[PDB]
From a paper:
The [name] ([name]) protein is a conserved cell polarity regulator with anti-tumorigenic properties. [name] is an important regulator of cell polarity and acts as a scaffolding protein to mediate a diverse set of cellular signalling pathways via its four [name] domains. The zoonotic Tick-born encephalitis virus [name] encodes for the [name] protein, which has been shown to interact with [name] in a [name] domain dependent manner. In summary, we show that [name] [name] C-terminal PBM binds [name] PDZ3 in order to interact with [name].
To understand the interactions of [name] [name] domain interactions with [name] PBM sequences in more detail we determined crystal structures of [name] PDZ3:[name]_CTN complexes as well as a structure of [name] PDZ3 apo. Binding of [name]_CTN in a non-canonical manner requires no significant change in the [name] PDZ3 domain fold, with a superimposition of both [name] PDZ3 chains yielding an RMSD of 1.15 Å in Chain A and 1.35 Å in Chain B over the Cα backbone atoms. Furthermore, all side chain rotamers of residues involved in the canonical ligand binding groove are identical with those found in PDZ3:[name]_CTN, including His1071PDZ3. No major changes in B-factor distribution for backbone atoms are observed upon [name]_CTN binding.
Residue numbers in the entry:
A (entry chain B): 11 to 19, 22 to 32, 43 to 102
B (entry chain A): 11 to 31, 40 to 102
Write the structure that this text describes.
């Protein structure tokens, strides 16, 4: 399954694992935090961030894409 | 939140995927668990973190090191797992 997630972005309230081709996964989600309230779940694979493919991104690149300045923070994730 | 899981590996498909080795939380991350597969029936779940395998620390294990530890000869396959 796939879906687009927009964060109202302040801590994001999630942790991620992986990076370079396993990919980048959400390892922890703070209950009632921003990521949790946005619909992100443990185990989700982050496919893209604001249109930027991160299927093959480094852990540092994934962190940077998520914290970089933007109009709206939008993610594409794959679960199950 | 920490458990000892026994995985009776019988040579068939184990039905899980793992991600090995900013901010990190320790252990080998279980990324995928096939519903009703061997790993699922054994008690493993997505999000779990394998801390050790038969007493061997795998907190810092690479993906292959973790695979080797899970597939090497042993009498029992006992996993130390942290769960949130």
């Amino acid at each position: 399954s796939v879906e687009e997630i927009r964060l109202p972005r302040g801590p994001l309230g999630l942790s991620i694992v992986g990076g370079s081709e396993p990919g980048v996964f959400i390892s922890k989600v703070l209950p009632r935090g921003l990521a949790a309230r946005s619909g992100l779940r443990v185990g989700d694979r982050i496919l893209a961030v604001n249109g930027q493919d991160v299927r093959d991104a480094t852990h540092q690149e994934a962190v940077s894409a998520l914290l970089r300045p933007c109009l709206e923070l939008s993610l594409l994730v794959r679960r199950d």
